[PDB]
Design a protein around this ligand. Sequence first.
Ligand SMILES: Cc1ccnnc1NC(=O)Cc1cccc(Cl)c1
Ligand SMILES: Cc1ccnnc1NC(=O)Cc1cccc(Cl)c1
Lengths: 304, 304
Amino acid sequence: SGFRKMAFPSGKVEGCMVQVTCGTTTLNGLWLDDVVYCPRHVICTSEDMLNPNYEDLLIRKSNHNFLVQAGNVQLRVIGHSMQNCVLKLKVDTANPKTPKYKFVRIQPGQTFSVLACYNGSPSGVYQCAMRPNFTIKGSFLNGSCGSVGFNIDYDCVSFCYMHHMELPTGVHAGTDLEGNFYGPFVDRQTAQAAGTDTTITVNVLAWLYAAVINGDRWFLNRFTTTLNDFNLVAMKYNYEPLTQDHVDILGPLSAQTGIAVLDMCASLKELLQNGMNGRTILGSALLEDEFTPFDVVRQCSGVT
Amino acid sequence: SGFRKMAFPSGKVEGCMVQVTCGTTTLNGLWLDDVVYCPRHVICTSEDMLNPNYEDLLIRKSNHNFLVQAGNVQLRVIGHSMQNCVLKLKVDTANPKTPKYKFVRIQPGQTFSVLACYNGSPSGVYQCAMRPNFTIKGSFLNGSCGSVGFNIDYDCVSFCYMHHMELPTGVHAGTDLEGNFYGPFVDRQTAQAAGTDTTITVNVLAWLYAAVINGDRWFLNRFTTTLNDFNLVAMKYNYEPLTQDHVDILGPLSAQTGIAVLDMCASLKELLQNGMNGRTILGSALLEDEFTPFDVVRQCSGVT
Ligand SMILES: Cc1ccnnc1NC(=O)Cc1cccc(Cl)c1
Ligand SMILES: Cc1ccnnc1NC(=O)Cc1cccc(Cl)c1
């Protein structure tokens, strides 16, 4: 009973967080095995951020300039290298708390948990989606850079995001763990266009299935639609076009509830065209797109 | 930049979760020092739940009937006792992962994080509020009983909730860690009235301050109100009456933003009387009441 925006338990990731300081800049690092990963802009001052030449800035730094700490543990840095927008600091000690992990590059529309950290200390955890425009709408203040996003499958942590910056619009941008930005962004203090975002249609449909499973059913109607007709409505309302691949991933939810995917599309079409009429679905007064079909199945079956 | 429904990092609590089995019933337990706490209904079968005599049911159980496990660790039970609706199983080994902790009974309207668990394994973490009617709207399935709610201050975990049951309405009920139910509930399979709930006014005001801090300002108006006038509106809309104690706790937010508490009350009055007009505040199309003033200050200042 009930359906919440749930994050993965963060313990496995808390055990990896360290503080990285270079010069006057302090941010968060991720310590896995004998490597600490952090945003490369840890080597910048404020005047450097307007147009940094990272290669030149990194040449002025030595291993001993990177101060890495995790409470009472000071780590000894024995190597440093830049990979895209991340620095990899080789340390002489493998993190005893390294969980089983992978580095993955997620697709837009996928969800993950963020462990917000400041000065290497975890402050909170929340679930969010990678927007179709490759930004995230997180909660990040100065010092949160280097905080990571992840998913967990059994005992394996798949790290997918490292936070780098806030755009002038207040949305967030960052990289995969190889330092490649999601989206067109660069790690520089210049105004940068995020570009047109859309609503993640397959996730809204998944959430409407979660709603029916939990008893919110008022939006079910006597109609059906086609992918073509639904996509005309999706276009008008800035929703992602629905494909057969999306219909296929909704298969388990359609099978469990007995509501055909195109019939749920007709409920979504009617909600887009008429609004909520002052009612709510799973405690929301808008159409929620931060739950994937996999998230809904996981939460509705009690997977650990 | 940004404001999210953030949970506390759950690692300290994940280290305390165990599975407790008695007979055919399995649920979650909390292992702190050399005691495991769990709902007393672990001793019931399904036929017992309609009207259990817990004292009699517990008399048929011995220490060796309580199977406690945490992965590869089987705990040896050397004592058992019932305290209100919880069982306390004394074990021969102190949990090496016991964090600094306290047991607290929270007030209605306060928030906390829940680590949803099944069979002793954490599945997810979310933040919620204790409703004014002493229920929570969580996400709990069969086997989640014994999952706990908590807050964290520095390195100290204050455990405030243990989940016991879902009401026929799909809302959740549970106890403090001394086994006293929040609200009028009893641990029996009987339909039980939750009673009239209200919206947590001070939390909505705190969240409107979080909104102004993060740039959502469209709801600010040229008006002011009084506590008396505001409370007539609060009454009409089933909001908790606002008191000077609530105004006092909003003081830091009023000081930071320069918006007097009664001026924010006039914005809230106008939103109650006119609705959102199809707009959003911090990504919500309704007035959010699951952030306390302390939560807003914590999140807006980046506290770890
Ligand atoms: C102040 C802040 C808030 C939220 N997230 N990040 C934050 N820090 C920054 O954006 C700092 C920064 C400035 C230019 C480029 C880059 Cl890569 C980083
Ligand atoms: C099935 C389920 C879902 C969510 N939360 N809890 C759940 N279990 C129960 O409510 C089981 C139960 C039945 C009667 C009394 C008591 Cl104390 C417990």
